Amino acid sequence: QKSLGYTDNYTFASMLFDPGKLDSDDALNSNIIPFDLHSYMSGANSGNRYKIDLKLDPIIAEHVTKISANPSGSNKPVEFVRNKDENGNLTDTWEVNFIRANDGLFGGAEILSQYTAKNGKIELDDTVGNIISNAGNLSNNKLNHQVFVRDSRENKIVRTSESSGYFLTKADDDLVNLENNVSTENNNAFKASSGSATYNENVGEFGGILIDQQIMKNGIFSYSKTKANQWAYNYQIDKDLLPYIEGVELHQYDYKGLNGFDKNYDAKNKVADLTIDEVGNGTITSDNLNKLIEFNNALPETVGVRVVLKLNKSVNNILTKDAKYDSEGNLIRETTKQKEDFTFAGYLTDSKGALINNTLGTSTLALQDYDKDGLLDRYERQLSLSDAENEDTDGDGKNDGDEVVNYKTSPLVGK
Ligand SMILES: [Ca+2]
Ligand SMILES: [Ca+2]
Ligand SMILES: [Ca+2]
Ligand SMILES: [Ca+2]
Ligand SMILES: [Ca+2]
């Protein structure tokens, strides 16, 4: 139930989760969710240190009986083992070793090239159509999924390997439309695309949210179009976040060769101000899209696009909306939200407005308040430096949330 911190290993440059959509009658009537797993590794690795984790929506994890996939270049599948939490229950995350030689998926020496784990099967105890019809309204809450590399030595997520998103259903009618009428302009250029959403306290004056969409290249694509054939970048932000957003910007996201993507925020990389409507959708174009997207022309580098959400209030005001306080103004741990997920999506359209093949990348941002002290887990780990599973880190009777916003005293000192 508790979230994980982040660590830094640039060698795990990309890790994309590519699942099938769930709208066609063939997929809707099957008990198996198919997927491929793409990875790019910039340096050699070995041993049992690093793992591959796959966190699934609890609606689906309730029905999962087996998860498996073929390692890169193999015919024999490997089974994902379900994870057990601290006390012994089963999480909604399955885990497999990374290095192929240690019952994993990818070879420790296959670097500087895209490698795929194919024939991935999420075997369920029921057909997906039955679960979709017994899951509720999937127009706001989606069937979230997440994949990342885990450093088992420090129990942290490798920052550059995180990728999230959600499975497409018929409730996502707009997105499902574009993956059925794909454009013909460059159906060969790109392999797959996934997104990732994180919280960043250095953005603006109240913190920010970073949406980093990567698009893997099949070859060495180069973007050169006439002014009348210029593409457009289309984005959709979760409507549940608009009250808290001061503004949205488009940043450059350069794949810096062997170093991959720089995950840090840099306000100097802003290239445009994005406009959005009431439902959270928007689009942007130019007479030369090379101004707004670092396509890494003529190079086999992954294409990246960064969207920044500058908040107008502190991020802790999201789960603490319609919460209750006492006479002294302190938060009662039993009134604030504990979990809430937000969904985003980004994709490229051609001149007529059709999707470029495998350019749709969805992302989910999982905000969590495990100890329910009013401070998000990401806030405590990245800014306040307090224990994410303790209402009172220093042990002086003053809760962590009350100590930071109310008492204005350090939540780390008790004497
Ligand atoms: Ca570059
Ligand atoms: Ca907390
Ligand atoms: Ca805490
Ligand atoms: Ca305290
Ligand atoms: Ca204190």
Do the beta carbons of residue 341 and residue 144 sit within 8 Å?
A: yes
Distance CA 274, CA 216 (A): 24
CA angle 216, 378, 244 (to 5 degrees): 85
Q: What is the resolution of this structure in A?
A: 3.1
Tell me the HSE value of 308 on the side-chain side, using a 13 A CA sphere: 27
Please tell me whether residue 107 adopts helix, strand or coil conformation.
coil
Cα(398) to ligand 5 centroid in Å equals 7
Final residue before a domain boundary, out of 136, 171, 206:
171
Neighbours of 338 (CB within 10 A): 13
Same domain membership, residue 159 and residue 60 = yes
Q: What share of the chain is helix, strand, coil (3-state, %, to 5)?
A: 15, 35, 50
Tell me the HSE value of 123 on the side-chain side, using a 13 A CA sphere: 8
Q: Which of 214, 213, 215 is nearest to 189 (CA)?
A: 215
Count of structural domains, the chain: 2
- Residue span of the structural domain in which 357 resides: 190-368
Q: Which two tokens stand for residue 391?
A: 């209402």
Strands 156-158 and 5-7 turn out to be parallel
Determine, yes or no, domain membership for 274. Answer: yes
Do the beta carbons of residue 186 and residue 215 sit within 8 Å?
A: no
Give the DSSP H or E segment for 174: helix 173-178
Residue with tokens 């940043």: 251
Same domain membership, residue 160 and residue 195 = no
Determine, yes or no, domain membership for 406. Answer: no
Cα(117) to ligand 1 centroid in Å equals 26
Cα(69) to ligand 5 centroid in Å equals 49
Q: Any idea which ligand is nearest the CA of 415?
A: 5
Same domain membership, residue 194 and residue 167 = no
Q: Which two tokens stand for residue 112?
A: 């500087």
Cα(409) to ligand 4 centroid in Å equals 9
Give the DSSP H or E segment for 173: helix 173-178
The most distant pair of C-alpha atoms in the chain lies apart, rounded to whole Å, by: 68
Paired residues of 39 in beta bridges: 15, 115
Distance CA 164, CA 195 (A): 6
Final residue before a domain boundary, out of 171, 199, 227:
171
| End-to-end Cα, the chain, rounded Å | 32
Distances (CA, A) of 325 to 67, 320, 368: 45, 10, 20
Same domain membership, residue 218 and residue 116 = no
Q: Which of 57, 45, 49 is nearest to 17 (CA)?
A: 57
Paired residues of 164 in beta bridges: 146, 195
What backbone phi and psi angles, to 5 degrees, belong to 90? Answer: -95, 120
Q: Which two tokens stand for residue 68?
A: 């498996």
Same domain membership, residue 205 and residue 164 = no
Do the beta carbons of residue 193 and residue 355 sit within 8 Å?
A: no
Q: Any idea which ligand is nearest the CA of 302?
A: 1
What backbone phi and psi angles, to 5 degrees, belong to 411? Answer: -85, 20
Experimental method: X-ray
Distance CA 353, CA 302 (A): 23
Cα(15) to ligand 1 centroid in Å equals 18
Determine, yes or no, domain membership for 413. Answer: no
CA angle 346, 63, 237 (to 5 degrees): 15
CATH number of the domain within which 65 lies = 2.60.40
Strands 303-311 and 81-84 turn out to be unpaired
Determine, yes or no, domain membership for 131. Answer: yes
Tell me the HSE value of 68 on the side-chain side, using a 13 A CA sphere: 12
Chain-centre distance of CA 17, in angstroms?
10
Final residue before a domain boundary, out of 171, 200, 232:
171
Distance CA 97, CA 105 (A): 7
**In 17-82, which residue ranges form alpha helices assigned H by DSSP?**
25-28, 58-61
Neighbours of 316 (CB within 10 A): 22
Distances (CA, A) of 250 to 75, 197, 268, 286, 400: 42, 14, 11, 13, 34
Paired residues of 36 in beta bridges: 18
What backbone phi and psi angles, to 5 degrees, belong to 403? Answer: -65, -30
Paired residues of 37 in beta bridges: 17, 117
Same domain membership, residue 223 and residue 164 = no
